[PDB]
Structures are given as C-alpha cells and as structure tokens.
From a paper:
As a member of the Embecovirus, HKU1 uses a primary glycan-based receptor (9-O-acetylated sialosides) and a secondary proteinaceous receptor for host cell targeting and membrane fusion. One unique feature of HKU1 spike is that the C-terminal domain (CTD) of S1 (also known as receptor-binding domain, RBD) is exceptionally larger than other CoV RBDs, and the receptor-binding motif (RBM) of HKU1 adopts a unique fold. Proteinaceous receptor of HKU1 was identified as transmembrane serine protease 2 (TMPRSS2) and HKU1 RBD binds TMPRSS2 with nanomolar affinity. The TMPRSS2–RBD interaction occurred between a groove formed on the HKU1 RBD apex and a hydrophobic surface near the active site in the C-terminal trypsin-like serine peptidase (SP) domain of TMPRSS2.
Using bio-layer interferometry (BLI), we determined the equilibrium dissociation constant (KD) for RBD–TMPRSS2 interaction. The affinity of 1A-RBD–TMPRSS2 (KD = 323 nM) was ~2-fold lower than that of 1B-RBD–TMPRSS2 (KD = 170 nM), which is consistent with the KD values reported previously. The difference between 1A-RBD–TMPRSS2 and 1B-RBD–TMPRSS2 maps may attribute to higher binding affinity of 1B RBD for TMPRSS2 that enhances stability of the complex. Therefore, we mainly used 1B-RBD–TMPRSS2 structure for subsequent structural analysis. RBG is an arch-shaped module comprising an antiparallel β-hairpin (β10–β11, previously referred to as a horn) and a proline-rich loop; two disulfide bridges C504–C518 and C520–C533 stabilize the fold of this module. We identified 14 HKU1 spike residues and 8 TMPRSS2 residues mediating the interactions, rendering an interfacial area of 752 Å2. In particular, residues T509, L510, Y511, V512 and W515 on the β-hairpin of RBG are packed against a hydrophobic patch on TMPRSS2 formed by residues Y416, L419 and W461. Residues L521, P522, T527, Y528 and S529 from the proline-rich loop of RBG interact with a hydrophobic protrusion formed by L430, Y414 and Y469 of TMPRSS2. A π-stacking interaction is formed between TMRPSS2 R470 and 1B RBD R517. Additionally, the salt bridges between HKU1 spike D507 and TMPRSS2 R470, and between HKU1 spike D505 and TMPRSS2 K467 further stabilize the TMPRSS2–RBD interaction. Lastly, HKU1 spike K487 forms an additional salt bridge with TMPRSS2 D417, and this is the only non-RBG residue contributing to the interaction.
Residue numbers in the entry:
A (entry chain B): 129 to 492
B (entry chain A): 323 to 607
The structure:
C-alpha cells in the first residue's frame, strides 16, 4: 500500500513505479507517471482500444468497473504525451507507452471508470439548520453507519464495495468490523431497521492518524456484498489533483446531524448549502490558532447558522462542477453547531485520494 | 433699523470645520443681501434646489439653517445630490425634498485653521482627543457604527482573570454599564479559550448580530452617532484600571486634505424655511 507511488522501486520487477496511474481535471484526463523524468504526463488517443481501459481502471483500484472512455482536446498545457504502440506483442499497457511530442488526433483520453456524480433533479433542499424539507434521490452516495442498530456516524460511497467516513468513529474499541452496520438509500431513520443492513467486512484506518490534533482523520469501511446500483444509490467521483477550487465556492453538506448543539440526531437525512473557507484564513491566530493541518478543510459560514453538528460526521462535502459531484471533504469535527466564528471543520479527501487507491488495489 | 445677519462673516471665519463635525446656525430676524453674499465670498459654484435662485431677490424666509464644512479633494464628487458616497451616508445627509441652495466656495490658505471633532458620547467617554494630524487636514467618516447606552468596550476583570488564550484586554467598566460578551469555550486540548465579542475589527466582524456595534447611516439633522473601535485594542491588561481606550484604535476615519488651486474648499446646504414668509427679509431691491 504505502510502498506504491513513492519514487523508490520495491519489488524486483518495478511495477510500483511503472504502473502509477491517476486521473486529472474535471474532464477526467488520464495521466501516467514517467519514471525517467519524475513527472505525470497525459496519454494519446492514437491507437488505443477499450481493452487497455480495462487494464487502466484495474490498476486504479477500480477493478473491472468501466463506464466510458472518449478522446478530448488537451487543456492542461502539457508539453509531452504518452504514446501507445501496437507493434509490441506484450499484453501490458505500460511497457507499450513511450514519450512523444504530440498525438496525431490532437486529443487526450477522457477515462471514466464508474458512472458517478449524477443524481435525480431536486429543487428545494436546505434541511440542515434553518431550512426546509428534502427529497429522495438527490444524495444517493450518502449512507448511514450503525453500531447496535443506532446511528453513530455517516458515510459516503465511491464504489459498490467501499464506504468512506471519519476515523474518530472507528477509534478503539470500535475498530472491529463486526460491530458496524451500514444502511444505503433510506431517508427515514425509522425505516433502516428490518433487513436493510450492509455489514462491514473490514475497517480501514489511516496509519498516521493522531487523536490529539484529530489530523489525518480518514476511514474506509468495506462491505462483503457490492452495492447494487439503481436510482436511489449511486456513487460519487473521487476528486482529482489540479482543479482550481475557487474561494467561496457553493458546496453542499449532508448528514443525519442534529438541528442544534447537544441535541438529538435528525429523524430524516438533512442536507444544506455551505461555502468554502480558505485554509490560510482558517489557520490564523484568530479562527483556530494554527490548528488546521494541510490535510484539513474549513467550510461553512463564519456568521454561522448553517453548519455541521454531531451526527453529521462521516458526511460528504460535495460541489457541482460540469454536472459531476466531487467528494472534497469529510466531516471530521465541529466546534458547536450553527454558531458564529466556529464553523464546520472537515478532513481533506484530496490529500488522501492516493491513499484510498493504495487500499483499493491491495484489498481487491 | 433692523440689523444685518452678516452671513458672510460666518463662512469667512478663521475656523473651518470638517464634514464629520458640520455645524448649524439658525439665522433669524435679520437682514442680508444675496449680491453681497455672492461678492464678499469667492464662490466656486452656486446652485439651488426646490427654490428658484432668481426668486431669492425680494422673497424672504422665516429661518435659514446654514451648514458649512470643508471639501476633501478626493470627496468633491461624492457631494452629488442623492448619492450613496461616504459623505452622504456617514457625514451629512442632504434632504433633497426641502428648499436647499448649495454654495461652493474657498478660503485662502493663510487664514484657515481646522477644528476637527467627533460629535458623539459613545466614543468620547471611552478615550479620545486631538485627532493626530497636520495643520490642514479634514476628517471624513466612511462608515458610522452605533452602540447602546451600556456597551463597555472594556471587558470584565473576572472572565480574563480565568481566561488563558486570546487574552483580550480588559478594564473595570463604569457604574451603570454591562460587561462585554465572552463565551468561555474548549477546543481539543486548549482549555478555557475565551473568544470575547466584536473580535476582529468592527468592519470585519462576520457576526453583524453578536457584536453590539451595529452599522447605521446618518440622517437629516443628526451627525454620526459613532465611529469604529478595534475591540481587541481598548484597555490595559492591568485589572484595577478605568476604561481608558487608546488613541490608535480609532479606525473608520481617513485624512484627505482640503487644498485646491492654492486655496481650501468649503461647501454649504443652506436649508431654508418659509418662502414669502418671515421677518428675516433682505434689501436685494
Ligand atoms: C524489443 C527489442 O528487440 N528492442 C529493444 C527495445 O524495445 C527497447 O526499447 C530498447 C531499450 O529500451 O532495447 C532494445 O533492445
Ligand atoms: C517506446 C519505445 O520505443 N520503446 C520500446 C518499448 O516500449 C518496448 O516495450 C520494447 C520491447 O517491446 O521495445 C522498445 O523499442
Ligand atoms: C448693507 C448692504 O450690504 N446692502 C447693500 C446696500 O448698502 C447697497 O446700497 C445696495 C446697492 O449696491 O446693495 C446692498 O447689498
Ligand atoms: C488680514 C488677515 O487676516 N490676514 C493676515 C495678514 O493681515 C497678515 O499680514 C499676514 C500674515 O500671515 O497674513 C494673514 O495672517
Ligand atoms: C503625540 C501625537 O499625537 N503626535 C504625533 C507626532 O508626534 C508624530 O510626529 C506624527 C507623525 O505622523 O504623528 C502624531 O500622531
Ligand atoms: C438599554 C439596555 O439597558 N438594554 C441592553 C441593551 O443596551 C443591550 O444591547 C442588550 C444586549 O446586551 O442588553 C440589554 O439589557
């Protein structure tokens, strides 16, 4: 896991560095790490067929899942592109790639490994503090995780088999997967009782997670049975390095959290609009006195009244961009609920996007 | 036998005010002449609203509310009628619906001295004084803040004798007032962390509701109720000490000058009253 994509070859064959793969951009432009120049470069559309897309998603912790793949005009401004060759009789794609100045088709590949980031159209949903009721189907990635059939923390899905949430919910002695039970696609907490559970087979916690400063707070529940996708349950695409996330950008938070501090959890799933808070604004002497690590995100309003609460932990921080939803944050902790000068504090998924893939491939 | 108002003597006085501290002189029961006011005063421009300029000759008034204040060079254009600039929203509002004749004029820089002030009690019982500046500046508010008749900028001796981070300054407030807000909080390992009220600065307080310092706008007749005070800058740390706020905390003010072609600019909104009626008439004929 941690030996993957570090610049040092571990296995004698060197598959750790030759098969480093990630996506890029809101339009999902594929990149392949070049060991000779220590940089990421996109791939050409030229002489590429869909069988190589099977091998790319498989090495990207997505196994056989493959939604679609088409060629798009390059936008990252890269000077070099990987070029495939069909003269080689081998079956591995990475020995087939070599550097070239430009592609003949003037296009780079848009790779989609799973149909994510799409939901049913919903008009009015601001159900976290100070708002109105919600509608089903607008947040199909959102799931709830239960210990002894009562809610503890929320969750969001990215594949049929994996659920991401916060590590403080899975802290000791709750590090045993037998206690956890996940429910998917049910809005009412009075209905997730009879046979709707999805048991977690193994809990994954961050190795450098520290509870004193509550930094590196990420956790990955994996189910035995893959989730059967329909209109009520759909995944959300993992965000890529290289999007210019603007300040103040309109994001959405969700969860079964309380409507006020120290209050009981909500009967129905709540979801309301919040805004990003810039990290250099948040880690000043004023907002939290240098408590925000680079693996942490501040979101919401400094004026308050729209913020996460207890029970909102594990929920998704999602934004809309090119009609695709992106899970940029996970609710780690919150100093109060709906209060000014103390907004919701969220864990940065973006720092840990590569760490999720390291557990996806090794436990496939 | 009825005497003259000598309005020209009042504008050409050596003391020239600022838009923050504009005055008012209710001229009544005396004579004048608009020709002598136009001649003895070096007029830049002269305009009248809701009253004909040519009809001042012979027609007269019950009482004339005469206001004056100097013009900043960068704030000459904001004195447009009905504008939403800093001068018309935080220094002096001009009633457009009343009979008003505006006068623009200048006085020579040899005989002009400026007595800047800050009309208010909320911001003058709590430390203030000479507006630190040079021999020819004109203060102008850019955002007026109003507070209650109980806000003690100074915090409470006790909460702080038990705080331990963000120790915001503090002093014993005055008999009849209420301690400022402070919600002893806890974050991870930092215990008793006090985030007392109006924290950043009155103009960056993202809590326009928790900070007792609310924002407001001036009003026909009424000057600025109060300016701005960084609430983390008011008070010594010693406890047994009165609420002496300090001179370097007054934020919300700006010092633009008054010098145009080797001469200082001044304005006026002569508010009127009583057309074809009064005993303060004129000889303009
Ligand atoms: C297959 C073959 O005979 N030619 C290889 C070539 O593919 C390889 O790129 C090069 C150095 O990397 O070494 C040659 O011997
Ligand atoms: C890109 C390039 O020119 N190098 C090829 C290499 O990709 C291939 O794996 C090897 C053996 O088949 O032959 C080399 O010539
Ligand atoms: C005293 C005064 O200011 N009034 C003068 C008056 O003496 C003079 O006779 C008349 C004609 O020039 O003009 C008026 O303005
Ligand atoms: C009349 C008046 O007020 N102006 C005086 C002037 O008489 C004096 O000779 C000179 C000295 O500065 O300038 C002004 O102070
Ligand atoms: C004590 C006082 O208020 N006067 C100071 C003055 O000594 C200083 O030279 C000047 C420079 O801007 O600033 C003023 O505030
Ligand atoms: C006038 C008065 O005595 N009432 C005060 C008010 O000024 C203050 O803004 C409010 C909030 O602290 O508390 C009230 O008791």
């Amino acid at each position: 896991p941690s030996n993957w994509c570090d610049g040092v070859s571990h296995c004698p064959g060197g598959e750790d560095e030759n098969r480093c793969v990630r996506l890029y951009g809101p339009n999902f432009i594929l990149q392949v790490y070049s060991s000779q120049r220590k940089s990421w470069h996109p791939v050409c559309q030229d002489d590429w067929n869909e069988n190589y897309g099977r091998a790319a998603c498989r090495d990207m912790g997505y196994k056989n899942n493959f939604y679609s793949s088409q060629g798009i005009v390059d936008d990252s401004g890269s000077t070099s592109f990987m070029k495939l060759n069909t003269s080689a009789g081998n079956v591995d794609i990475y020995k087939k790639l070599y550097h070239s100045d430009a592609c003949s088709s003037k296009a780079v590949v848009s790779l989609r490994c799973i149909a994510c980031g799409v939901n049913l159209n919903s008009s009015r949903q601001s159900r976290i503090v100070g708002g109105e009721s919600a509608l089903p189907g607008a947040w199909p990635w959102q799931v709830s995780l239960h210990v002894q059939n009562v809610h503890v923390c929320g969750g969001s899905i990215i594949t049929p088999e994996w659920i991401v949430t916060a590590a403080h919910c899975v802290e000791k002695p709750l590090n045993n997967p037998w206690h956890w039970t996940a429910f998917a696609g049910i809005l009412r907490q009075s209905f997730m009782f009879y046979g709707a559970g999805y048991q977690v087979e193994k809990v994954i916690s961050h190795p450098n997670y520290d509870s004193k400063t509550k930094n590196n707070d990420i956790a990955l529940m994996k189910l035995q049975k893959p989730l059967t996708f329909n209109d009520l349950v759909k995944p959300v695409c993992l965000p890529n390095p290289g999007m210019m996330l603007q300040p103040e950008q309109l994001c959405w938070i969700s969860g079964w959290g309380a409507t006020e501090e120290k209050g009981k959890t909500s009967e129905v799933l709540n979801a309301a609009k919040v805004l990003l808070i810039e990290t250099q604004r948040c880690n000043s002497r004023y907002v939290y006195d240098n408590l925000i690590t680079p693996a942490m995100i501040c979101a919401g309003f400094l004026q308050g009244n729209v913020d996460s609460c207890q029970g909102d932990a594990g929920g998704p921080l999602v934004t809309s961009k090119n009609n695709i939803w992106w899970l940029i944050g996970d609710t780690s902790w919150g100093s109060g609920c709906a209060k000014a000068y103390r907004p919701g504090v969220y864990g940065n998924v973006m720092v840990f996007t590569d760490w999720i893939y390291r557990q996806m491939r090794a436990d496939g | 036998n009825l005497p003259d108002c000598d309005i020209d003597n009042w504008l050409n006085n050596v003391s020239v005010p600022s838009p923050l501290n504009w005055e008012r002189r209710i001229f009544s029961n005396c004579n004048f002449n608009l020709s002598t006011l136009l001649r003895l005063v070096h007029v830049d421009s002269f305009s009248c609203n809701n009253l004909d300029k040519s009809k001042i000759f012979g027609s007269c008034f019950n009482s004339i509310t005469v206001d004056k204040f100097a013009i900043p060079n960068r704030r000459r254009d904001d004195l447009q009628l009905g504008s939403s600039g800093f001068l018309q929203s935080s220094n002096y509002k001009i009633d457009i619906s009343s009979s008003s004749c505006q006068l623009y004029y200048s006085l020579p820089l040899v005989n002009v001295t400026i007595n800047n002030f800050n009309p208010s009690s909320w911001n003058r019982r709590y430390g203030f004084g000479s507006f630190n500046l040079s021999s020819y500046d004109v203060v102008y508010s850019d955002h007026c803040f109003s507070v209650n008749s109980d806000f003690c900028p100074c915090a409470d001796p006790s909460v702080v004798n038990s705080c331990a981070k963000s120790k915001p300054p503090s002093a014993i407030c005055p008999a009849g007032t209420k301690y400022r807000h402070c919600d002893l909080d806890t974050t991870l390992y930092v215990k008793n962390w006090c985030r007392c009220s109006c924290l950043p600065d009155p103009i960056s307080t993202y809590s326009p509701n928790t900070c007792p310092q609310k924002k407001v706008v001036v009003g026909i007749g009424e000057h600025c109720p109060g300016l701005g005070i960084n609430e983390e800058k008011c008070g010594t740390q010693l406890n047994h000490s009165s609420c002496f706020c300090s001179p370097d905390a007054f934020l919300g003010w700006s010092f633009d000058s008054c010098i145009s072609n080797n001469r200082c600019n001044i304005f006026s909104n002569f508010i009127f009253n009583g057309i074809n009626s009064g005993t303060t008439c004129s000889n303009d004929l």
